[PDB]
Design an enzyme around this catalytic site. Structure first.
Site, short mmCIF file in Angstrom:
data_model
loop_
_atom_site.label_atom_id
_atom_site.label_comp_id
_atom_site.label_asym_id
_atom_site.label_seq_id
_atom_site.Cartn_x
_atom_site.Cartn_y
_atom_site.Cartn_z
N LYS A 280 5.07 2.66 -1.04
CA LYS A 280 6.75 2.25 -1.45
C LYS A 280 7.18 3.79 -1.53
O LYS A 280 6.52 4.72 -2.36
CB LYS A 280 6.85 1.36 -2.66
N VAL B 66 0.78 -1.20 -0.13
CA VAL B 66 -0.07 -0.09 0.04
C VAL B 66 0.85 1.33 -0.03
O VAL B 66 0.22 2.36 -0.01
CB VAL B 66 -0.92 0.16 1.17
CG1 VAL B 66 -1.93 -1.25 0.99
CG2 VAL B 66 -0.12 0.01 2.54
N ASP C 42 7.22 15.85 11.83
CA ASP C 42 6.99 15.58 10.54
C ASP C 42 5.72 15.24 10.21
O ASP C 42 5.21 14.60 9.36
CB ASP C 42 8.06 14.29 10.04
CG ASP C 42 8.18 14.48 8.30
OD1 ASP C 42 7.79 15.34 7.74
OD2 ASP C 42 8.21 13.18 7.67
N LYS D 151 5.27 -1.74 8.10
CA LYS D 151 6.23 -0.89 7.58
C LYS D 151 7.72 -1.78 7.47
O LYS D 151 8.11 -2.06 8.74
CB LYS D 151 6.50 0.46 8.38
CG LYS D 151 7.27 1.31 7.66
CD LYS D 151 7.35 2.75 8.21
CE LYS D 151 8.16 3.57 7.68
NZ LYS D 151 8.31 4.73 8.17
C1 LIG Z 1 2.08 6.92 7.06
O1 LIG Z 1 2.61 5.92 7.66
C2 LIG Z 1 2.31 4.66 8.09
C3 LIG Z 1 1.07 4.45 7.45
C4 LIG Z 1 0.63 3.12 7.63
C5 LIG Z 1 -0.85 2.64 7.13
C6 LIG Z 1 -1.64 2.23 8.22
N1 LIG Z 1 -2.92 1.59 7.58
C7 LIG Z 1 -3.18 1.75 6.30
C8 LIG Z 1 -2.25 2.24 5.43
C9 LIG Z 1 -2.86 2.30 3.92
C10 LIG Z 1 -3.65 1.17 3.60
C11 LIG Z 1 -4.09 1.34 2.31
C12 LIG Z 1 -3.93 2.39 1.43
C13 LIG Z 1 -4.55 2.40 -0.09
C14 LIG Z 1 -4.52 0.94 -0.85
C15 LIG Z 1 -6.01 0.96 -1.72
N2 LIG Z 1 -6.74 1.92 -1.97
C16 LIG Z 1 -6.73 2.20 -3.36
C17 LIG Z 1 -6.56 3.28 -1.44
C18 LIG Z 1 -5.75 3.27 -0.13
C19 LIG Z 1 -2.95 3.47 1.94
C20 LIG Z 1 -2.65 3.43 3.13
C21 LIG Z 1 -1.08 2.66 5.61
C22 LIG Z 1 0.05 3.05 5.03
C23 LIG Z 1 1.37 2.09 8.54
C24 LIG Z 1 2.61 2.68 9.09
O2 LIG Z 1 3.38 2.00 9.68
C25 LIG Z 1 3.45 0.56 9.74
C26 LIG Z 1 3.19 4.00 8.68
O3 LIG Z 1 4.45 4.42 9.38
C27 LIG Z 1 4.21 4.77 10.62
#
Ligand SMILES: COc1cc(-c2cncc(-c3ccc(C4CCN(C)CC4)cc3)c2C)cc(OC)c1OC
Ligand SMILES: COc1cc(-c2cncc(-c3ccc(C4CCN(C)CC4)cc3)c2C)cc(OC)c1OC
Ligand SMILES: COc1cc(-c2cncc(-c3ccc(C4CCN(C)CC4)cc3)c2C)cc(OC)c1OC
Length: 283
Positions: A15, A13, A133, A34
Protein backbone atom coordinates in the site's frame (compact mmCIF):
# COMPACT_ATOMS: atom_id res chain seq x y z
CA UNK A 1 -17.08 -19.51 -24.89
CA UNK A 2 -16.79 -18.38 -21.24
CA UNK A 3 -14.19 -15.65 -20.51
CA UNK A 4 -13.39 -16.02 -16.78
CA UNK A 5 -12.28 -12.57 -15.58
CA UNK A 6 -13.05 -12.96 -11.84
CA UNK A 7 -9.87 -12.43 -9.75
CA UNK A 8 -10.18 -13.17 -6.00
CA UNK A 9 -8.16 -10.53 -4.03
CA UNK A 10 -6.73 -12.51 -1.10
CA UNK A 11 -4.25 -10.24 0.73
CA UNK A 12 -2.77 -6.78 0.40
CA UNK A 13 1.04 -7.09 -0.02
CA UNK A 14 1.68 -3.36 -0.66
CA UNK A 15 0.00 0.00 0.00
CA UNK A 16 1.48 3.40 -0.94
CA UNK A 17 0.90 6.66 -2.84
CA UNK A 18 0.75 4.38 -6.00
CA UNK A 19 -2.38 2.55 -4.71
CA UNK A 20 -2.21 -1.08 -3.56
CA UNK A 21 -0.79 -4.48 -4.66
CA UNK A 22 -2.79 -7.63 -3.87
CA UNK A 23 -2.03 -11.29 -4.09
CA UNK A 24 -4.96 -12.59 -6.12
CA UNK A 25 -6.15 -15.87 -7.51
CA UNK A 26 -7.27 -16.54 -11.09
CA UNK A 27 -8.29 -20.14 -12.07
CA UNK A 28 -6.37 -21.56 -9.08
CA UNK A 29 -3.13 -19.58 -9.86
CA UNK A 30 -1.51 -16.69 -7.93
CA UNK A 31 -1.41 -13.35 -9.73
CA UNK A 32 -0.35 -9.91 -8.48
CA UNK A 33 -2.93 -7.11 -8.91
CA UNK A 34 -1.80 -3.48 -8.75
CA UNK A 35 -4.81 -1.18 -8.15
CA UNK A 36 -3.79 2.39 -9.15
CA UNK A 37 -4.47 5.51 -7.10
CA UNK A 38 -5.81 8.61 -8.92
CA UNK A 39 -2.29 10.07 -8.14
CA UNK A 40 -0.66 7.41 -10.32
CA UNK A 41 -3.24 6.86 -13.21
CA UNK A 42 -0.63 7.98 -15.81
CA UNK A 43 1.67 5.07 -14.76
CA UNK A 44 -1.11 2.59 -15.77
CA UNK A 45 -1.51 4.36 -19.13
CA UNK A 46 2.27 4.40 -19.82
CA UNK A 47 2.85 0.76 -18.95
CA UNK A 48 -0.28 -0.30 -20.88
CA UNK A 49 0.84 1.71 -23.93
CA UNK A 50 4.30 0.07 -23.75
CA UNK A 51 2.91 -3.50 -23.52
CA UNK A 52 0.44 -2.69 -26.37
CA UNK A 53 3.53 -1.72 -28.43
CA UNK A 54 5.83 -4.63 -27.41
CA UNK A 55 4.86 -7.73 -25.43
CA UNK A 56 8.05 -8.04 -23.35
CA UNK A 57 8.84 -11.62 -22.33
CA UNK A 58 12.04 -12.15 -20.36
CA UNK A 59 12.89 -14.19 -17.23
CA UNK A 60 14.22 -11.02 -15.49
CA UNK A 61 11.25 -8.73 -16.35
CA UNK A 62 8.07 -9.06 -14.22
CA UNK A 63 5.66 -11.02 -16.41
CA UNK A 64 2.68 -9.15 -17.79
CA UNK A 65 -0.75 -10.79 -17.69
CA UNK A 66 -3.31 -8.02 -18.19
CA UNK A 67 -4.29 -4.32 -18.07
CA UNK A 68 -7.91 -3.84 -16.96
CA UNK A 69 -10.02 -0.66 -16.95
CA UNK A 70 -13.50 -1.03 -15.34
CA UNK A 71 -16.22 1.70 -15.39
CA UNK A 72 -17.61 2.53 -11.88
CA UNK A 73 -20.52 4.96 -11.05
CA UNK A 74 -18.25 8.05 -10.59
CA UNK A 75 -14.66 6.69 -11.16
CA UNK A 76 -12.56 4.49 -13.47
CA UNK A 77 -10.76 1.51 -11.79
CA UNK A 78 -7.32 0.63 -13.24
CA UNK A 79 -5.65 -2.72 -12.54
CA UNK A 80 -2.32 -4.13 -13.77
CA UNK A 81 -2.11 -7.92 -13.38
CA UNK A 82 1.29 -9.64 -13.38
CA UNK A 83 3.04 -12.82 -12.25
CA UNK A 84 3.20 -13.13 -8.43
CA UNK A 85 6.56 -13.57 -6.65
CA UNK A 86 5.86 -14.72 -3.11
CA UNK A 87 9.37 -13.84 -1.81
CA UNK A 88 8.57 -10.13 -2.47
CA UNK A 89 10.92 -7.31 -3.33
CA UNK A 90 14.71 -7.33 -3.15
CA UNK A 91 14.43 -4.40 -0.68
CA UNK A 92 12.26 -6.64 1.58
CA UNK A 93 14.49 -9.72 1.10
CA UNK A 94 17.79 -7.95 1.96
CA UNK A 95 16.42 -6.67 5.34
CA UNK A 96 16.75 -10.15 7.01
CA UNK A 97 18.69 -12.29 4.48
CA UNK A 98 22.48 -12.41 4.06
CA UNK A 99 24.05 -13.81 0.85
CA UNK A 100 26.93 -16.05 -0.15
CA UNK A 101 29.08 -15.37 -3.23
CA UNK A 102 26.96 -17.55 -5.56
CA UNK A 103 23.61 -15.98 -4.47
CA UNK A 104 24.98 -12.42 -4.58
CA UNK A 105 26.29 -12.86 -8.15
CA UNK A 106 23.10 -14.66 -9.30
CA UNK A 107 20.97 -11.73 -8.01
CA UNK A 108 23.08 -8.99 -9.59
CA UNK A 109 23.66 -10.76 -12.94
CA UNK A 110 19.88 -11.43 -13.21
CA UNK A 111 19.17 -7.71 -12.67
CA UNK A 112 21.83 -6.73 -15.26
CA UNK A 113 20.27 -9.27 -17.67
CA UNK A 114 16.78 -7.75 -17.27
CA UNK A 115 18.18 -4.24 -17.64
CA UNK A 116 20.23 -5.01 -20.76
CA UNK A 117 17.10 -6.63 -22.26
CA UNK A 118 15.16 -3.40 -21.66
CA UNK A 119 17.95 -1.19 -23.01
CA UNK A 120 18.69 -3.07 -26.28
CA UNK A 121 16.79 -2.42 -29.53
CA UNK A 122 16.04 -5.74 -31.37
CA UNK A 123 15.19 -5.39 -35.12
CA UNK A 124 12.73 -7.47 -37.21
CA UNK A 125 12.02 -7.43 -31.96
CA UNK A 126 11.54 -4.52 -29.51
CA UNK A 127 12.30 -0.82 -29.15
CA UNK A 128 15.03 0.22 -26.70
CA UNK A 129 13.47 0.97 -23.27
CA UNK A 130 14.77 2.95 -20.29
CA UNK A 131 13.15 2.14 -16.89
CA UNK A 132 13.61 5.54 -15.14
CA UNK A 133 12.83 4.28 -11.58
CA UNK A 134 15.21 1.37 -10.97
CA UNK A 135 15.63 0.63 -7.23
CA UNK A 136 15.51 -2.35 -4.84
CA UNK A 137 11.72 -1.94 -4.21
CA UNK A 138 11.16 -2.30 -8.02
CA UNK A 139 13.02 -5.68 -8.16
CA UNK A 140 11.31 -8.96 -7.13
CA UNK A 141 13.08 -12.12 -5.89
CA UNK A 142 12.14 -15.42 -7.55
CA UNK A 143 12.33 -18.85 -5.91
CA UNK A 144 15.14 -19.91 -8.32
CA UNK A 145 17.41 -17.17 -6.91
CA UNK A 146 17.16 -14.81 -9.90
CA UNK A 147 15.32 -11.49 -9.74
CA UNK A 148 12.99 -9.62 -12.11
CA UNK A 149 12.62 -5.91 -12.74
CA UNK A 150 9.14 -4.46 -12.07
CA UNK A 151 7.16 -1.22 -12.71
CA UNK A 152 7.37 0.24 -16.22
CA UNK A 153 5.05 3.10 -15.30
CA UNK A 154 7.80 5.72 -16.01
CA UNK A 155 9.53 3.78 -18.84
CA UNK A 156 10.41 5.46 -22.14
CA UNK A 157 10.72 3.74 -25.55
CA UNK A 158 13.08 4.67 -28.46
CA UNK A 159 5.79 11.24 -11.71
CA UNK A 160 9.65 11.63 -11.58
CA UNK A 161 12.19 8.95 -10.50
CA UNK A 162 12.78 8.18 -6.80
CA UNK A 163 14.97 11.06 -5.59
CA UNK A 164 17.42 8.90 -3.54
CA UNK A 165 18.35 7.05 -6.79
CA UNK A 166 18.56 10.08 -9.13
CA UNK A 167 21.75 10.49 -11.16
CA UNK A 168 23.74 13.73 -10.91
CA UNK A 169 22.57 14.99 -14.35
CA UNK A 170 18.92 14.63 -13.19
CA UNK A 171 19.64 16.54 -9.95
CA UNK A 172 21.58 19.39 -11.66
CA UNK A 173 19.15 19.44 -14.68
CA UNK A 174 22.03 19.00 -17.24
CA UNK A 175 20.58 15.71 -18.55
CA UNK A 176 20.49 15.69 -22.43
CA UNK A 177 16.65 15.08 -22.53
CA UNK A 178 16.60 14.78 -26.41
CA UNK A 179 19.11 11.86 -26.30
CA UNK A 180 17.62 8.45 -25.50
CA UNK A 181 21.09 7.22 -24.35
CA UNK A 182 20.80 9.79 -21.50
CA UNK A 183 18.00 7.69 -19.97
CA UNK A 184 20.00 4.46 -20.21
CA UNK A 185 22.85 6.20 -18.33
CA UNK A 186 20.44 7.32 -15.55
CA UNK A 187 19.37 3.66 -15.16
CA UNK A 188 23.05 2.55 -14.94
CA UNK A 189 23.66 5.00 -12.03
CA UNK A 190 20.64 3.51 -10.20
CA UNK A 191 21.87 -0.02 -10.99
CA UNK A 192 25.18 0.80 -9.33
CA UNK A 193 23.30 1.88 -6.16
CA UNK A 194 21.31 -1.40 -6.17
CA UNK A 195 24.57 -3.34 -6.65
CA UNK A 196 25.93 -1.56 -3.51
CA UNK A 197 22.78 -2.43 -1.51
CA UNK A 198 23.13 -6.13 -2.41
CA UNK A 199 26.92 -6.41 -1.97
CA UNK A 200 26.68 -5.05 1.60
CA UNK A 201 24.61 -8.20 2.46
CA UNK A 202 27.20 -10.66 1.02
CA UNK A 203 29.15 -12.36 3.87
CA UNK A 204 32.99 -12.45 3.68
CA UNK A 205 35.33 -13.60 6.48
CA UNK A 206 32.28 -13.78 8.85
CA UNK A 207 31.50 -10.05 8.28
CA UNK A 208 28.38 -8.47 6.71
CA UNK A 209 26.93 -4.93 6.71
CA UNK A 210 23.37 -4.28 7.90
CA UNK A 211 20.86 -3.38 5.15
CA UNK A 212 20.89 0.34 4.47
CA UNK A 213 19.51 2.36 1.57
CA UNK A 214 21.92 4.37 -0.61
CA UNK A 215 23.12 7.62 1.05
CA UNK A 216 21.57 6.61 4.42
CA UNK A 217 24.51 8.32 6.20
CA UNK A 218 24.32 11.72 4.40
CA UNK A 219 20.61 12.53 3.67
CA UNK A 220 17.41 12.44 5.73
CA UNK A 221 14.99 9.56 5.96
CA UNK A 222 12.86 11.24 3.23
CA UNK A 223 15.35 13.34 1.32
CA UNK A 224 14.48 16.44 -0.67
CA UNK A 225 15.62 17.04 -4.25
CA UNK A 226 17.96 19.70 -2.85
CA UNK A 227 19.34 17.30 -0.17
CA UNK A 228 20.26 14.87 -2.97
CA UNK A 229 21.70 17.53 -5.29
CA UNK A 230 24.08 18.83 -2.58
CA UNK A 231 25.41 15.31 -1.82
CA UNK A 232 25.62 13.94 -5.36
CA UNK A 233 26.38 17.07 -7.47
CA UNK A 234 27.96 19.69 -5.23
CA UNK A 235 30.04 17.49 -2.87
CA UNK A 236 30.22 14.58 -5.40
CA UNK A 237 29.80 11.96 -2.60
CA UNK A 238 29.38 8.28 -3.45
CA UNK A 239 28.39 5.34 -1.27
CA UNK A 240 31.09 4.05 1.15
CA UNK A 241 33.00 0.85 0.21
CA UNK A 242 33.95 -0.91 3.49
CA UNK A 243 37.57 -2.07 3.96
CA UNK A 244 36.40 -5.68 4.50
CA UNK A 245 35.36 -5.87 0.80
CA UNK A 246 39.03 -5.61 -0.29
CA UNK A 247 39.85 -8.99 1.41
CA UNK A 248 37.25 -10.74 -0.80
CA UNK A 249 37.88 -11.10 -4.58
CA UNK A 250 34.13 -10.96 -5.48
CA UNK A 251 33.43 -7.80 -3.45
CA UNK A 252 36.69 -6.21 -4.75
CA UNK A 253 35.40 -6.82 -8.33
CA UNK A 254 31.86 -5.58 -7.45
CA UNK A 255 33.33 -2.35 -5.88
CA UNK A 256 35.14 -1.67 -9.20
CA UNK A 257 31.95 -2.27 -11.14
CA UNK A 258 29.78 -0.02 -8.98
CA UNK A 259 32.46 2.81 -9.27
CA UNK A 260 32.13 2.55 -13.10
CA UNK A 261 28.36 3.05 -12.83
CA UNK A 262 28.84 6.27 -10.73
CA UNK A 263 31.01 8.49 -12.91
CA UNK A 264 29.79 12.14 -12.91
CA UNK A 265 30.19 12.07 -16.75
CA UNK A 266 27.22 9.94 -17.92
CA UNK A 267 29.05 8.88 -21.13
CA UNK A 268 31.89 7.34 -18.99
CA UNK A 269 29.56 4.86 -17.24
CA UNK A 270 29.53 1.18 -18.26
CA UNK A 271 26.69 -0.08 -20.43
CA UNK A 272 24.35 -2.84 -19.18
CA UNK A 273 25.89 -5.26 -21.72
CA UNK A 274 29.43 -4.49 -20.45
CA UNK A 275 28.24 -5.00 -16.83
CA UNK A 276 26.88 -8.47 -17.81
CA UNK A 277 30.19 -9.45 -19.40
CA UNK A 278 32.15 -8.28 -16.32
CA UNK A 279 29.82 -10.21 -13.97
CA UNK A 280 30.15 -13.48 -16.00
CA UNK A 281 34.01 -13.27 -15.46
CA UNK A 282 33.77 -12.76 -11.64
CA UNK A 283 34.42 -16.08 -9.79
C1 LIG B 1 7.25 -3.46 -7.41
O1 LIG B 1 6.05 -3.37 -8.18
C2 LIG B 1 5.16 -4.41 -8.26
C3 LIG B 1 5.30 -5.56 -7.48
C4 LIG B 1 4.36 -6.60 -7.64
C5 LIG B 1 4.46 -7.85 -6.83
C6 LIG B 1 4.55 -9.05 -7.49
N1 LIG B 1 4.71 -10.23 -6.86
C7 LIG B 1 4.72 -10.21 -5.53
C8 LIG B 1 4.66 -9.05 -4.77
C9 LIG B 1 4.75 -9.26 -3.25
C10 LIG B 1 4.18 -10.38 -2.67
C11 LIG B 1 4.33 -10.62 -1.30
C12 LIG B 1 4.98 -9.73 -0.46
C13 LIG B 1 5.16 -9.92 1.03
C14 LIG B 1 3.96 -10.59 1.71
C15 LIG B 1 4.28 -11.62 2.82
N2 LIG B 1 5.66 -11.66 3.39
C16 LIG B 1 5.61 -11.45 4.86
C17 LIG B 1 6.69 -10.79 2.78
C18 LIG B 1 6.45 -10.70 1.28
C19 LIG B 1 5.54 -8.62 -1.05
C20 LIG B 1 5.45 -8.39 -2.44
C21 LIG B 1 4.50 -7.85 -5.44
C22 LIG B 1 4.36 -6.55 -4.69
C23 LIG B 1 3.36 -6.45 -8.57
C24 LIG B 1 3.23 -5.28 -9.32
O2 LIG B 1 2.21 -5.04 -10.22
C25 LIG B 1 1.11 -5.96 -10.25
C26 LIG B 1 4.12 -4.25 -9.13
O3 LIG B 1 4.00 -3.06 -9.87
C27 LIG B 1 4.39 -3.08 -11.22
C1 LIG C 1 -11.14 -9.67 -21.05
O1 LIG C 1 -10.62 -9.72 -19.71
C2 LIG C 1 -9.91 -10.84 -19.32
C3 LIG C 1 -9.84 -12.03 -20.06
C4 LIG C 1 -9.04 -13.12 -19.56
C5 LIG C 1 -9.17 -14.32 -20.42
C6 LIG C 1 -9.90 -15.37 -19.83
N1 LIG C 1 -10.19 -16.49 -20.53
C7 LIG C 1 -9.82 -16.58 -21.81
C8 LIG C 1 -9.17 -15.54 -22.50
C9 LIG C 1 -8.87 -15.74 -23.88
C10 LIG C 1 -7.62 -15.60 -24.43
C11 LIG C 1 -7.45 -15.74 -25.81
C12 LIG C 1 -8.50 -16.05 -26.67
C13 LIG C 1 -8.13 -16.17 -28.15
C14 LIG C 1 -8.37 -17.53 -28.75
C15 LIG C 1 -8.01 -17.55 -30.26
N2 LIG C 1 -7.53 -16.23 -30.72
C16 LIG C 1 -7.02 -16.17 -32.13
C17 LIG C 1 -8.62 -15.25 -30.47
C18 LIG C 1 -8.83 -15.09 -28.95
C19 LIG C 1 -9.77 -16.17 -26.12
C20 LIG C 1 -9.95 -16.03 -24.74
C21 LIG C 1 -8.82 -14.37 -21.76
C22 LIG C 1 -7.98 -13.29 -22.37
C23 LIG C 1 -8.42 -13.06 -18.29
C24 LIG C 1 -8.52 -11.89 -17.59
O2 LIG C 1 -7.86 -11.75 -16.37
C25 LIG C 1 -6.79 -12.68 -16.04
C26 LIG C 1 -9.24 -10.82 -18.09
O3 LIG C 1 -9.36 -9.65 -17.36
C27 LIG C 1 -8.18 -8.81 -17.27
C1 LIG D 1 -4.05 -13.60 -20.01
O1 LIG D 1 -3.45 -14.61 -19.20
C2 LIG D 1 -3.79 -15.92 -19.41
C3 LIG D 1 -4.53 -16.34 -20.45
C4 LIG D 1 -4.81 -17.71 -20.65
C5 LIG D 1 -5.61 -18.15 -21.84
C6 LIG D 1 -6.94 -18.59 -21.69
N1 LIG D 1 -7.63 -18.98 -22.78
C7 LIG D 1 -7.07 -19.02 -23.93
C8 LIG D 1 -5.77 -18.58 -24.23
C9 LIG D 1 -5.27 -18.62 -25.60
C10 LIG D 1 -5.51 -19.70 -26.47
C11 LIG D 1 -5.05 -19.69 -27.74
C12 LIG D 1 -4.34 -18.62 -28.32
C13 LIG D 1 -3.77 -18.61 -29.69
C14 LIG D 1 -3.20 -19.97 -30.12
C15 LIG D 1 -2.60 -20.03 -31.52
N2 LIG D 1 -3.38 -19.27 -32.52
C16 LIG D 1 -4.47 -20.10 -33.05
C17 LIG D 1 -3.90 -17.98 -32.00
C18 LIG D 1 -4.74 -18.18 -30.74
C19 LIG D 1 -4.11 -17.54 -27.49
C20 LIG D 1 -4.58 -17.54 -26.20
C21 LIG D 1 -5.04 -18.19 -23.09
C22 LIG D 1 -3.59 -17.82 -23.26
C23 LIG D 1 -4.24 -18.59 -19.76
C24 LIG D 1 -3.46 -18.14 -18.72
O2 LIG D 1 -2.86 -18.91 -17.77
C25 LIG D 1 -3.03 -20.35 -17.99
C26 LIG D 1 -3.18 -16.80 -18.55
O3 LIG D 1 -2.34 -16.37 -17.58
C27 LIG D 1 -2.86 -16.01 -16.34
Amino acid sequence: RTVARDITLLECVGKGRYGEVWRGSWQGENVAVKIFSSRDEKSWFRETELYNTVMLRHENILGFIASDMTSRHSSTQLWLITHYHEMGSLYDYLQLTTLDTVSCLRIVLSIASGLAHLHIEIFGGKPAIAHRDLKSKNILVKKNGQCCIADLGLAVMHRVGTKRYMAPEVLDETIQVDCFDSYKRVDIWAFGLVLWEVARRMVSNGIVEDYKPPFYDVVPNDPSFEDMRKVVCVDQQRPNIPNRWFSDPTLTSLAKLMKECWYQNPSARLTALRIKKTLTKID
